[PDB]
Amino acid sequence: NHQVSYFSLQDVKLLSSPFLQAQQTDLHYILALDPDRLSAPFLREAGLTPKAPSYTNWENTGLDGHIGGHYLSALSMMYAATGDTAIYHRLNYMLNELHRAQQAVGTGFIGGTPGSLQLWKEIKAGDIRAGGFSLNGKWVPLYNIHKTYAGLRDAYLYAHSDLARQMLIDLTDWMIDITSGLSDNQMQDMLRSEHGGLNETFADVAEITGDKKYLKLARRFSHKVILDPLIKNEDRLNGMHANTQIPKVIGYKRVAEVSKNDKDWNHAAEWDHAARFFWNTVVNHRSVCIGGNSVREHFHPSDNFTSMLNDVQGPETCNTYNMLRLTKMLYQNSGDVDNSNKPDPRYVDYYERALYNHILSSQEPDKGGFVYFTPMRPGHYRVYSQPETSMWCCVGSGLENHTKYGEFIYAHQQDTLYVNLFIPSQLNWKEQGVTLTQETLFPDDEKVTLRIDKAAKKNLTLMIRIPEWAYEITINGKKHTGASTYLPIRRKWKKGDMITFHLPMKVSLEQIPDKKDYYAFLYGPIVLATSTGTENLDGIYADDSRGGHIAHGRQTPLQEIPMLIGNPDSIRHSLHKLSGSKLAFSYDGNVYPTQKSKSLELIPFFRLHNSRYAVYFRQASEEQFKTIQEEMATAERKATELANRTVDLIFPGEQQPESDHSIQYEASETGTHKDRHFRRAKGWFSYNLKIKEEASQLMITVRQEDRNKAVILLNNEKLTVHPTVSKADKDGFIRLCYLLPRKLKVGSCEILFKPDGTEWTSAVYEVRLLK
Amino acid sequence: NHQVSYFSLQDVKLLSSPFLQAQQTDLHYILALDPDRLSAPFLREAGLTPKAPSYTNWENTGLDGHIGGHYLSALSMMYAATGDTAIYHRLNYMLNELHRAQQAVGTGFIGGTPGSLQLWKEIKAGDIRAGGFSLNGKWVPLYNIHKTYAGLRDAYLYAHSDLARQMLIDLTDWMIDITSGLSDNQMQDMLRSEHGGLNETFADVAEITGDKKYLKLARRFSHKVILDPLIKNEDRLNGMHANTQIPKVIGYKRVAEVSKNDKDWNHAAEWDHAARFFWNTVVNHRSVCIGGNSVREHFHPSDNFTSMLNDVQGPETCNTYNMLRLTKMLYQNSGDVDNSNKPDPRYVDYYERALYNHILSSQEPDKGGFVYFTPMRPGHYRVYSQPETSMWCCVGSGLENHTKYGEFIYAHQQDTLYVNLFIPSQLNWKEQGVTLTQETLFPDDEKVTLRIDKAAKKNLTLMIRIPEWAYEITINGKKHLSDIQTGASTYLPIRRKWKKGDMITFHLPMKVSLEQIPDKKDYYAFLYGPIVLATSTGTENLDGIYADDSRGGHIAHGRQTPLQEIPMLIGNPDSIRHSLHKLSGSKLAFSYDGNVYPTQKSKSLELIPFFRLHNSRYAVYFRQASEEQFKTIQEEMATAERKATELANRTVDLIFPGEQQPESDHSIQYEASETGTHKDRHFRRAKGWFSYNLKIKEEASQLMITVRQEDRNKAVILLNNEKLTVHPTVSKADKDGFIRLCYLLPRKLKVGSCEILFKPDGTEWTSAVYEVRLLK
């Protein structure tokens, strides 16, 4: 049939490696969560009495119920991988509690969003008030319920719960009823609010049941404004919130898989193609070396990574989790597209890069804790979640990440096995009566062995992946380019057979994709990093506060971080492998400033924890050293000085900064000009500024040619002091700097913008509070 | 300072090669033109008495003066390359005649457009009536005068005429005065009419004079509706006339070069970036293997090359000429963008591909004659211009093309020479006291030798381009292996104290590749190294292969061959690729020794370089099929494609409303009319009326009009003012909603001309008409 299939997690057992460690640490974190707290939002909205308070953080500020969704997925997948009894009891319990909630309402509805029944009543009637991250005064409710749809799906598919299947079908039938009276225009209006991968889950329900009404529902939930450009090979992603988009694209691809033999619809190949193009543009133009994307959750321009190297909010972990889910889908049928009937190993090159360097790095391996933002800025650190405090999106996906490292190691195609990832594992290839063990100390050693533990004397082809970054193969003791490919080995495999091969690894120096003067060291597919200090690791284990996912500690000026001096080729050659069982390197070349520790020590980024770090280093030629150092010593130092005086910061029109500052508005809009986001209002808009130290100054950014004006109120007191207008920057933005008449005291403070004798407010692009 | 510079044409002498042949053939064609005929439009509009009638064709049907513009450029550049005295005398004469015209009016105006003074008076006052290809009833006058601006610039920069400089400044100052009373809105409205690269030329005048007012004028003449998407990495080019857009983008890039140190404007990198993105999208998504783009002069969708493989109007030559000018600009500062101080050789990969396969193929090498359209349809031919008859845009650019093959062979950067094209040449590198000779029989042999003929004992780096499609070199007998640095295109540095008598030998390994049509339909062309190969498929019905002066004589109107009669490659692409084998002899020649249908009874299919294939029908792209799918593919081609060919071979005349050249060729008139696109097809309609003259070479029985089915607006049809009242036979609607109305005429239209006029039939608009076809 040529169909490539994936193994279930039951049939791929992880052996001793960093991936098994990560699985076991995640198991401990999953088991630390209290199911009564995660179920509490659901019971409340069903009119039942909760057994415990919900979690705080996002679980009581509008996204109540989203972690419960992920919890079902993570439980279900971890159960499939491990067979853990404690997990089993938790999953059974959680499913039954949500079942009680579903019975109490009796329509199929399950949800945690505060005032859910009121919300979905409004929507069914055609009262749809959508913003980018809001629907009828609620925080991304469609995104929220998607995690339940996905959770119940996963409980059926991975854990074999018939109860979950029935719960999922009732919940999907419920949404058919909610949307039965809405036009396509109304649907697409509603889908302007972030809605996760609802279209994926509804396509999943179509495959599970075999009923095309769910496939009709999936297409109605496919957001057209994103899809239509991607069909025509157009990247319009600049300025967009990135994690919003990737689950839609997963969705479009899934609709195409499940619609492959629908006679009444002929748009499958188009939707498939659109997803392939999306993957192409994000991976090859918008991704850093660790495999992630986005800055402050948003796609910056692909010709300008300045913000990637300057902002502490580097790639979000959810985005990579989702990019890997998309990768898995695209690889599966990649042979059908090019008509080779052979899947494309370049998808695996990316899978490996992102899994080893971003997913594996995003969990603290001993204590546990999940990362939201991984700064690519040289010399900052990343913040970890804690079980009871942190209810972020990146916790949710974090719980899922480490359950399923077995999922992409192999793939099967009739009589053919693809050996894709070099991860110690035992495979049960039941369809050919084969058991197989892969052993390797990779990435700390080059050798891989594949032992046939059991076989039924049938002719089978092992397709061994030969990566870009890597041909002698020893079969049964018998000894026997430059492109992602596969080496076929066909034998009547019997018990005791042994395939030995080596993966040659080299140092590369990989430039930031827009070709600015920044480079990271890699060894094979492993991103290396240096530890730059352990000072001011503020909130490294997060509390439950809004914005506790961000690394808010002191910003170090870039001139204090090691800068690589010379030509890239000699820089690359000056990194030297140290001896020992683990990957470790020293950079022994020209550096600025002087290194007191003699030389720079680099290790795999996935092992660098509880520390500030550089992955990308600033580079400078000897010719350009003077002017580069002047820029870093003056302009960059002052920008760091500004950040270290900053007490609070809001980016209007960016959903999480606004959500974190308790955005309220009346008759308001958001948008983009010159790659910066803004909000404005005909009515008003407001935030709560959170003030850890006393503040002397407020600093508002507008465009100079915007002739609309704004009154500013601070706790209802009108600010009448005249701003110090700065010179307009290249793109037409000016800062208004207001010396406040009294200091804002430690605590909270409302800032409100309403129009000053014009229709709109000024479009505000930044709100910053300074000492 | 690590800036890359180009050599002047005076310092790069072409040696014996196909490029020198092409230069010398173009010289003969340039000298065949009568300067009194080319100057006649200019003298007329100045109120002077011409010494001869203007040329016919486009020189008396609205674009009068456009070839005179190009003539100045071609003369100037050919003078620089050759030092030919006859060229010098022609240029001097032409400049003086246009100077007399400029003096007679005395405002700075020089132009050939009929009623020029009246036109520019209207425009200065703010009476602007712009269409896509018209301004105040005149055919692309801004495009026309651009050729004069460019011609005078070239006479200064290449030939060192101070008179041309002064004429250029007066003409630019004249346009400052014309546009001094117009708002930005009015400018941008006027720029909806095709205007060539006026913004480029005005930026050129800014650099020549050093006065920023010309740079301000250049930005005012930059069309924003095209620029603004390109700044944001958005390709919206589908449906657009392609040669209209590329000179604007050249313009935007040139404004960025000349604005590099302007403190009062900070948009240079944006405009530079927009041009780089444009180059990227056209080359990597919209270009065929010969390096060209467009079908019927327009950008089709990049996921659908069906029209590229069906239509006799393949890539236009002007587009590649212009793409190569943009390439040269982008390569020059490419090292500054990535801050490597090393220019990007992938620009050269394209330059080579387009130069060898499109530009070099577009001139008949012995007789002369320039090509307008190069069909990628399997089994058609291309039409050549003739000196006295053909005044097309592609003649104008054609005259320029072959003057300047010396321009991109090398580049220099202080102590570094880039050896980019493998073209026999003698280089005068005055800046390092070096004379150098490149000798090679490439593409017919792999060996290149570089001889140092003169040097001043300085350490200098020769950067030898190593193309994608291609490491042992030899300096003075001694062989020197270096590591194969990458599969990708790169430069090999060789640094010595070069002295007289030194010799660098290297080889360029060439392989057969099989390049698929970019949308991945089952069509492939053979290449050997960067050379596109082709097979000759016959010499039947080469109608108008040397064009007369008629409207539409640029198109290859001969009988279309059914695709089933053309060789189809049978088997998997890998085996197809391996089955092409090099024949012996000094010249590139191949036989395809694999499976072909229809079958070859006598000899294998013979493939040669497309640039040597002339006076013949050809295939570059072949249809491909597996052995499993062979039967059903042949059955499909024997019905549907055959019938489409049968229709075309019955066709006596054809018009595509809303496409500028078909309409212009059929004498478009209208009142209260609009054009536009639906489902990738162009249309015109009117509240007043619109009309054409149908040209009828043989007697015609039938008229066939295409509309959308759901358009409820209707049209009366008049043929020479007699109303056509016969009922059309309505065809079934195709997939995109289009129906053909087929009218059996009551009498045959006789051989000659005939007006067709559409006015509304009891509705506000006419029906939107997408095709008008006259059949026997």
Ligand SMILES: *[C@@H]1[C@@H](N)[C@@H](CO)[C@H](O)[C@H]1O
């Ligand atoms: C040919 C010619 N008609 C010119 C002006 O309209 C166009 O640019 C080219 O396509």
Ligand SMILES: OC[C@H]1[C@H](O)[C@@H](O)[C@H]2N[C@@H]12
């Ligand atoms: O809005 C819900 C999620 C979003 O997908 C991600 O970027 C983070 N903001 C949360």
Ligand SMILES: [Zn+2]
């Ligand atoms: Zn997240």
Ligand SMILES: [Zn+2]
């Ligand atoms: Zn042309």
